[model samples]
Target: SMHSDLTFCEIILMEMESHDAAWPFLEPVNPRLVSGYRRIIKNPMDFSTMRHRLSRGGYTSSEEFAADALLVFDNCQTFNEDDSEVGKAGHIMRRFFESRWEEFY
Candidate 1:
């Protein structure tokens, strides 16, 4: 109840989006472009969606916000092979977020 959750998320989002490797996660994956996207990924999440949901995400703590962010990475790993470009991006961004989160705690 005493944390700047919104500010933290906003700053983190800005930092992650600035990375070149963040390209694949900048927007929701176009279902048509990626075959079986809707079928495999039950709940798709992306940077754009995360940004949109920030104000109204009703996140009571860091865990809820982190859950959505982590979901994007999990979704990436589920749909793409670890060596693939998208998969690699997920891992990088995930690590970056984790490092930043720890600094605050």
Candidate 2:
């Protein structure tokens, strides 16, 4: 339901703060993932603006937008599960990205 799905697209912009640690993994993935996000979310400067524009988006529902947004998050999650330093950084990045929506929004 849309009610329960309010947070569906919330984690789309989530990312790790440590550039040094997260860069290698993020750089390669961002172009693809962010391009996906750009499909429904334009110029994503912050959340309040996003919320405003999202409500006015041509898309019919949040679920529709979320489907596109998840590609970005899911890619990071896949890398986060690996057992290397890069993976460790991915883990850190994923967690941070998951929580960053509010600040940016």
Candidate 3:
């Protein structure tokens, strides 16, 4: 689970949209996918602070957005397969290795 305003499930749904990745859950995350899944942020409080806000948002909005985004960004690889049996699977190895590559190499 995430903060009171978020959760791991919702975070993946968000990542599916934000990262331009596949949803592998309820529906396809991208439009090209016939069953594309559209994720929604149910709460404004999710982006209530500056760091978490969208880039075009105000300071508080950005912070809050960053905070929320970080929850996914920082722990991106931890997410497993989606709920859709036909949705296929995902792995954190790619993202994790990229992060390590960026930090050490």
Candidate 4:
């Protein structure tokens, strides 16, 4: 079951990477480019980081992976306005991911 769940997360990760809105979240935010990022979002997360963690088998459960995945959006919301490009992208992604998550068995 764990294996299957992890596989699901992997699939979701790939899908998200292909999305146009995923650009900002594909890599870690640069503190230089995004000022005060470290102060605002203490735990930075992105698709690249998630991929590394997934490759390393860093997550014990799918829920752990889910938490990190959602963290991308959470951090985005904290830093960017909800209607802005980056913030809106996170909203769209969260909707897609949550629906998929709920649908998974």
The whole-model lDDT of each prediction reads 0.84, 0.45, 0.34, 0.86
Model 1 TM: 0.88
TM-score of 4: 0.89
Best by lDDT: 4
If both were scored by lDDT, which would come out higher, candidate 2 or candidate 4?
4
Better of 1 and 2 by lDDT: 1
Error of 3 at 76 (Å): 7.9
Span of 10 residues, lowest total lDDT, candidate 2? 10-19
lDDT of 3 by residue, 54-100 (tens): 33333333234445444443222233234433222233323532453
Give the alpha carbon lDDT tens digit for every residue of 1-105 in model 2: 223344445334232323455454433335554455444434333223334434555335655554434443455445344776655755665565546544545
Model 2, global lDDT: 0.45
Q: Alpha carbon lDDT of residue 52, candidate 3?
A: 32
Model 3 spans with C-alpha error above 4 angstroms: 1-28, 34-36, 39-53, 59-63, 70-105
C-alpha lDDT (0 to 100) for residue 44 of candidate 4:
93
Off by over 4 Å in 4: 1-5
Assess every candidate by TM-score. 0.88, 0.35, 0.25, 0.89
Candidate 1 runs further than 4 Å off: 1-5
- Tens-place lDDT per residue, model 1, 7-94, is 8877888788898889998999986678889788999998888776775656666677789899989999999999988889889999
Give the candidates in order of TM-score, highest first. 4, 1, 2, 3
Judging by lDDT, tell me the better candidate of 1 and 3. Answer: 1
